[PDB]
């Protein structure tokens, strides 16, 4: 149980991260910046 060797999970987790990034780079941050600019 080395628990330090990279596993296949490395890729999978990365994939999921990107999805979150995709939903935060397009549907969260731009609206927030627009709202702050409007204020």
């Amino acid at each position: 149980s080395n628990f330090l060797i990279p596993n296949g999970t490395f890729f999978a987790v990365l994939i999921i991260f990107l999805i979150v990034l995709g939903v935060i780079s397009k549907w969260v941050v731009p609206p927030i910046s627009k709202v702050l600019a409007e204020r």
Binding site: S1, N2, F3, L4
Partner: protein
């Protein structure tokens, strides 16, 4: 003597040293950074918030060493390299 006993005794000594050094470093660095922050606040009480950003950076960096060490400590005492 069973070789694995020697290996794991050496590993326990090694991990003890790992975390002894890590705790020394983390304690000293946290103390020094907190000293800087407390002195800055006492010297300018309203500056408090502005200091949290840099201070934590320092904390982070300091803690890095300690916690990085901690990881390898586990690697010494849970998956001992060179174990037979």
């Amino acid at each position: 003597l069973d070789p694995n006993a020697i290996i794991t005794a050496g590993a326990l000594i090694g991990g003890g040293l790992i975390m002894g050094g890590g705790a020394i470093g983390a304690g000293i660095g946290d103390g020094i950074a907190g000293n800087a922050l407390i002195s800055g606040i006492a010297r300018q009480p309203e500056a408090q918030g502005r200091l949290f950003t840099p201070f934590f950076i320092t904390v982070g960096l300091v803690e890095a060493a300690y916690f990085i060490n901690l990881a390898f400590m586990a690697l010494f005492v849970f998956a001992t390299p060179g174990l037979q």
